[PDB]
Design a protein around this motif. Sequence first.
Motif, PDB file in Angstrom:
ATOM      1  N   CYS A 165      14.049  16.959  60.421  1.00  0.00           N
ATOM      2  CA  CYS A 165      14.539  16.982  59.030  1.00  0.00           C
ATOM      3  C   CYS A 165      14.576  15.580  58.407  1.00  0.00           C
ATOM      4  O   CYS A 165      14.328  15.422  57.209  1.00  0.00           O
ATOM      5  CB  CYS A 165      15.935  17.605  58.977  1.00  0.00           C
ATOM      6  SG  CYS A 165      15.949  19.408  58.696  1.00  0.00           S
ATOM      7  N   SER A 166      14.888  14.574  59.236  1.00  0.00           N
ATOM      8  CA  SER A 166      14.955  13.179  58.788  1.00  0.00           C
ATOM      9  C   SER A 166      13.617  12.463  59.000  1.00  0.00           C
ATOM     10  O   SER A 166      13.289  11.523  58.268  1.00  0.00           O
ATOM     11  CB  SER A 166      16.065  12.436  59.534  1.00  0.00           C
ATOM     12  OG  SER A 166      17.327  13.037  59.301  1.00  0.00           O
ATOM     13  N   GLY A 167      12.857  12.920  60.004  1.00  0.00           N
ATOM     14  CA  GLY A 167      11.557  12.333  60.307  1.00  0.00           C
ATOM     15  C   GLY A 167      11.611  11.291  61.413  1.00  0.00           C
ATOM     16  O   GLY A 167      10.911  10.278  61.341  1.00  0.00           O
ATOM     17  N   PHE A 168      12.443  11.541  62.436  1.00  0.00           N
ATOM     18  CA  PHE A 168      12.587  10.620  63.567  1.00  0.00           C
ATOM     19  C   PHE A 168      12.709  11.381  64.894  1.00  0.00           C
ATOM     20  O   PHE A 168      13.677  12.115  65.120  1.00  0.00           O
ATOM     21  CB  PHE A 168      13.800   9.677  63.355  1.00  0.00           C
ATOM     22  CG  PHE A 168      14.184   8.836  64.559  1.00  0.00           C
ATOM     23  CD1 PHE A 168      13.307   7.900  65.095  1.00  0.00           C
ATOM     24  CD2 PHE A 168      15.426   8.998  65.158  1.00  0.00           C
ATOM     25  CE1 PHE A 168      13.662   7.148  66.199  1.00  0.00           C
ATOM     26  CE2 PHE A 168      15.783   8.247  66.262  1.00  0.00           C
ATOM     27  CZ  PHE A 168      14.902   7.325  66.781  1.00  0.00           C
ATOM     28  N   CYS A 169      11.704  11.192  65.751  1.00  0.00           N
ATOM     29  CA  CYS A 169      11.676  11.809  67.075  1.00  0.00           C
ATOM     30  C   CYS A 169      11.747  10.729  68.152  1.00  0.00           C
ATOM     31  O   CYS A 169      10.883   9.848  68.215  1.00  0.00           O
ATOM     32  CB  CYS A 169      10.415  12.660  67.254  1.00  0.00           C
ATOM     33  SG  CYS A 169      10.502  14.299  66.461  1.00  0.00           S
ATOM     34  N   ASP A 170      12.788  10.801  68.992  1.00  0.00           N
ATOM     35  CA  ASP A 170      12.990   9.833  70.074  1.00  0.00           C
ATOM     36  C   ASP A 170      12.110  10.163  71.284  1.00  0.00           C
ATOM     37  O   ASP A 170      12.193  11.264  71.845  1.00  0.00           O
ATOM     38  CB  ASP A 170      14.464   9.793  70.486  1.00  0.00           C
ATOM     39  CG  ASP A 170      15.074   8.415  70.326  1.00  0.00           C
ATOM     40  OD1 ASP A 170      14.698   7.507  71.095  1.00  0.00           O
ATOM     41  OD2 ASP A 170      15.929   8.244  69.432  1.00  0.00           O
ATOM     42  N   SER A 171      11.269   9.193  71.667  1.00  0.00           N
ATOM     43  CA  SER A 171      10.345   9.344  72.797  1.00  0.00           C
ATOM     44  C   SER A 171      10.992   8.934  74.131  1.00  0.00           C
ATOM     45  O   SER A 171      10.407   9.147  75.198  1.00  0.00           O
ATOM     46  CB  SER A 171       9.080   8.513  72.550  1.00  0.00           C
ATOM     47  OG  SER A 171       8.074   8.805  73.507  1.00  0.00           O
ATOM     48  N   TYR A 172      12.200   8.351  74.060  1.00  0.00           N
ATOM     49  CA  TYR A 172      12.938   7.917  75.255  1.00  0.00           C
ATOM     50  C   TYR A 172      13.569   9.113  75.984  1.00  0.00           C
ATOM     51  O   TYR A 172      13.906   9.020  77.169  1.00  0.00           O
ATOM     52  CB  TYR A 172      14.025   6.908  74.865  1.00  0.00           C
ATOM     53  CG  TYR A 172      14.390   5.939  75.969  1.00  0.00           C
ATOM     54  CD1 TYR A 172      13.720   4.732  76.109  1.00  0.00           C
ATOM     55  CD2 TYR A 172      15.407   6.235  76.872  1.00  0.00           C
ATOM     56  CE1 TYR A 172      14.050   3.844  77.117  1.00  0.00           C
ATOM     57  CE2 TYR A 172      15.743   5.353  77.881  1.00  0.00           C
ATOM     58  CZ  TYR A 172      15.061   4.159  77.999  1.00  0.00           C
ATOM     59  OH  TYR A 172      15.393   3.280  79.003  1.00  0.00           O
ATOM     60  N   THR A 173      13.722  10.225  75.255  1.00  0.00           N
ATOM     61  CA  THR A 173      14.301  11.455  75.801  1.00  0.00           C
ATOM     62  C   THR A 173      13.531  12.692  75.321  1.00  0.00           C
ATOM     63  O   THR A 173      13.848  13.819  75.712  1.00  0.00           O
ATOM     64  CB  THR A 173      15.790  11.601  75.413  1.00  0.00           C
ATOM     65  OG1 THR A 173      15.954  11.402  74.004  1.00  0.00           O
ATOM     66  CG2 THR A 173      16.659  10.606  76.174  1.00  0.00           C
ATOM     67  N   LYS A 174      12.502  12.465  74.469  1.00  0.00           N
ATOM     68  CA  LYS A 174      11.651  13.539  73.897  1.00  0.00           C
ATOM     69  C   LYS A 174      12.488  14.561  73.107  1.00  0.00           C
ATOM     70  O   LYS A 174      12.393  15.778  73.324  1.00  0.00           O
ATOM     71  CB  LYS A 174      10.813  14.235  74.993  1.00  0.00           C
ATOM     72  CG  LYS A 174       9.693  13.370  75.554  1.00  0.00           C
ATOM     73  CD  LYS A 174       8.905  14.106  76.626  1.00  0.00           C
ATOM     74  CE  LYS A 174       7.786  13.243  77.183  1.00  0.00           C
ATOM     75  NZ  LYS A 174       7.003  13.957  78.230  1.00  0.00           N
TER      76      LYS A 174
END
Length: 35
Positions: free
Chosen positions: A18-27
């Motif tokens: 919804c905000s446009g941010f996906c964390d790749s440190y925890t997927k």
Amino acid sequence: GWCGDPGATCGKLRLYCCSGFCDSYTKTCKDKSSA
């Protein structure tokens, strides 16, 4: 049009953030902070 809520796995799964941010440190989908 559905959206992904915080705590969901982002990367190999469907739905976008919804905000446009996906964390790749925890997927997972996370919210971004404004400075």
